């Protein structure tokens, strides 16, 4: 036939957050179809790691305060919610943070592990105002996809949790914003092919090429119910 | 008779009493859902027809 | 006539749901109808969705 097949040819890295991916050649009308399908998949079904459970010594609930800490425990949990963590081997990781002194607390102060990658070591997490003030915190990170409120996890798990097991909402999806545009591909004997450029902006923990590969695999898996099942 | 506040409550499983201390008061910071017992109160029961 | 009073303070965190009254500063009130997925709403050429 006269059909042509898309090929991933260029991965332009604007920065550690912004990425450009080019796909070509594309036939008439396939650019927008593939772009919209890829955008709907990438914004909804990309796995990622997010902070889900935080334990702090001497703290019973999230509506209390600790001496020497400038902000409140709610602010601590909201700062934890925006932690960009990448886990290679396993799916559930316990993280430990210990700090004592005067000055801001960043993600670099977490006791680093061999299988945990911290994207932003300068991401501030807490502020200490008293030299004798010390903060010890245990952070639990699982891996998942989508958005999980604090009700589903407690409903699903039936075991009792001790007082102080502070639960935070998990935003597993690492993709923040993507967009695409279609231009004209350059072929010497075919001046009608199109080229698809997909712009992706996210935190770390996701390589753009592997994300697009995952989206293609899931789309093909979904279509597998249509290829032969009528 | 005077009413008493206690964790000793008839025909209630220990699961509902897990969030109460020995004095019958829920601990501070204990997550509680609808229907749980925040404080166990016992009132003397009058004579009942059988 | 009372012996002791126990006050218990409960903190409820309430998120937004279809049904809550949202209003602006110009008399244009309304009620949340449905919760839309992020990928489901209009976006501009830059990709930012309203």
Swiss-Prot record, chain A:
Transmembrane segments: none annotated. One of its GO terms (cellular component) is membrane. One of its GO terms (biological process) is submerged biofilm formation. It catalyses: RNA(n) + a ribonucleoside 5'-triphosphate = RNA(n+1) + diphosphate. Keywords: Acetylation, ADP-ribosylation, DNA-directed RNA polymerase, Nucleotidyltransferase, Transcription, Transferase. (Microbial infection) ADP-ribosylated on both alpha subunits by the phage T4 protein ModA. ADP-ribosylated on only one of the alpha subunits by the phage T4 protein Alt. Coiled coil: none annotated. Residues 157-160 are annotated as: Required for interaction with Crp at class II promoters. Changing residue 40 to C: In rpoA112; temperature-sensitive, blocks RNA polymerase assembly. Residues 1-230 are annotated as: Alpha N-terminal domain (alpha-NTD). The keyword Transcription applies. The N-terminal domain is essential for RNAP assembly and basal transcription, whereas the C-terminal domain is involved in interaction with transcriptional regulators (such as CRP) and with upstream promoter elements. Homodimer. The RNAP catalytic core consists of 2 alpha, 1 beta, 1 beta' and 1 omega subunit. When a sigma factor is associated with the core the holoenzyme is formed, which can initiate transcription. Both the N- and C-terminus interact with different regions of transcriptional regulator CRP. The rRNA transcription and antitermination complex (rrnTAC) consists of RNAP, NusA, NusB, NusE (rpsJ), NusG, SubB, ribosomal protein S4, DNA and precursor rRNA; S4 is more flexible than other subunits. Belongs to the RNA polymerase alpha chain family. This is DNA-directed RNA polymerase subunit alpha. It comes from Escherichia coli (strain K12). The lineage of its organism: Bacteria, Pseudomonadati, Pseudomonadota, Gammaproteobacteria, Enterobacterales. The chain holds residues 6 to 235 of 329 of the full protein.
Swiss-Prot record, chain B:
Acetylated on several lysine residues in the presence of glucose. Co-administration of salinamide and rifampicin or salinamide and myxopyronin suppresses the emergence of resistance to both antibiotics. Belongs to the RNA polymerase beta chain family. DNA-dependent RNA polymerase (RNAP) catalyzes the transcription of DNA into RNA using the four ribonucleoside triphosphates as substrates. Resistance to the antibiotics salinamide A, salinamide B, rifampicin, streptolydigin, CBR703, myxopyronin, and lipiarmycin can result from mutations in this protein. The RNAP catalytic core consists of 2 alpha, 1 beta, 1 beta' and 1 omega subunit. When a sigma factor is associated with the core the holoenzyme is formed, which can initiate transcription. The rRNA transcription and antitermination complex (rrnTAC) consists of RNAP, NusA, NusB, NusE (rpsJ), NusG, SubB, ribosomal protein S4, DNA and precursor rRNA; S4 is more flexible than other subunits. In pull-down experiments interacts with CedA. (Microbial infection) Interacts (via flap domain) with Escherichia phage lambda antitermination protein Q; this interaction renders bacterial RNAP resistant to transcription pausing and allows it to read through termination signals. This is DNA-directed RNA polymerase subunit beta. The lineage of its organism: Bacteria, Pseudomonadati, Pseudomonadota, Gammaproteobacteria, Enterobacterales.
Swiss-Prot record, chain C:
Acetylated on several lysine residues in the presence of glucose. The RNAP catalytic core consists of 2 alpha, 1 beta, 1 beta' and 1 omega subunit. When a sigma factor is associated with the core the holoenzyme is formed, which can initiate transcription. The rRNA transcription and antitermination complex (rrnTAC) consists of RNAP, NusA, NusB, NusE (rpsJ), NusG, SubB, ribosomal protein S4, DNA and precursor rRNA; S4 is more flexible than other subunits. In pull-down experiments interacts with CedA. (Microbial infection) Interacts (via flap domain) with Escherichia phage lambda antitermination protein Q; this interaction renders bacterial RNAP resistant to transcription pausing and allows it to read through termination signals. Co-administration of salinamide and rifampicin or salinamide and myxopyronin suppresses the emergence of resistance to both antibiotics. Belongs to the RNA polymerase beta chain family. DNA-dependent RNA polymerase (RNAP) catalyzes the transcription of DNA into RNA using the four ribonucleoside triphosphates as substrates. Resistance to the antibiotics salinamide A, salinamide B, rifampicin, streptolydigin, CBR703, myxopyronin, and lipiarmycin can result from mutations in this protein. Transmembrane segments: none annotated. It comes from the Bacteria. It comes from Escherichia coli (strain K12). This is DNA-directed RNA polymerase subunit beta.
């Amino acid at each position: 036939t006269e059909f042509l097949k898309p090929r991933l040819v260029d991965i332009e890295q604007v920065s550690s957050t912004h990425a450009k991916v080019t796909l070509e050649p594309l036939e008439r009308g396939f650019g927008h179809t593939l772009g919209n399908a890829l955008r709907r998949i990438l914004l909804s079904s990309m796995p990622g790691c997010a902070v889900t459970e935080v334990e702090i010594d001497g703290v019973l609930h999230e509506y209390s305060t600790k001496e020497g800490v400038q902000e409140d425990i709610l602010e601590i949990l909201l700062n934890l919610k925006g932690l960009a963590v990448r886990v290679q081997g396993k799916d559930e990781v316990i993280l430990t943070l210990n700090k004592s002194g005067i000055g801001p607390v960043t993600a670099a102060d977490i006791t680093h592990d061999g299988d945990v990658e911290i994207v932003k070591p300068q991401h501030v997490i807490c502020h200490l105002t008293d030299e004798n003030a010390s903060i010890s915190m245990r952070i639990k990170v699982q891996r998942g996809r989508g958005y999980v409120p604090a009700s589903t996890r407690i409903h699903s798990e039936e075991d009792e949790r001790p007082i102080g097991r502070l639960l935070v909402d998990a935003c597993y999806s690492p993709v923040e914003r993507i967009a695409y545009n279609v231009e004209a591909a350059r072929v010497e004997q075919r001046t009608d092919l199109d080229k698809l450029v997909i712009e992706m902006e996210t935190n770390g923990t996701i390589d753009p090429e592997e994300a697009i590969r995952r989206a293609a695999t899931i789309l093909a898996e979904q279509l597998e119910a249509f290829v032969d099942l009528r | 008779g005077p009413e008493e506040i206690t964790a000793d409550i008839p025909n209630v499983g220990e699961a509902a009493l897990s969030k109460l201390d020995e004095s019958g008061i829920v601990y501070i910071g204990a997550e509680v859902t609808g229907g749980d017992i925040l404080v166990g109160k016992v009132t003397p029961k009058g004579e009942t027809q059988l | 006539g009372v012996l002791k009073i126990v006050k218990v303070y409960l903190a409820v965190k309430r998120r937004i749901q279809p049904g809550d009254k949202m209003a602006g500063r110009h008399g244009n009130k309304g009620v949340i109808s449905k919760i839309n997925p992020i990928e489901d709403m209009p976006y501009d050429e830059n990709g930012t969705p309203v």
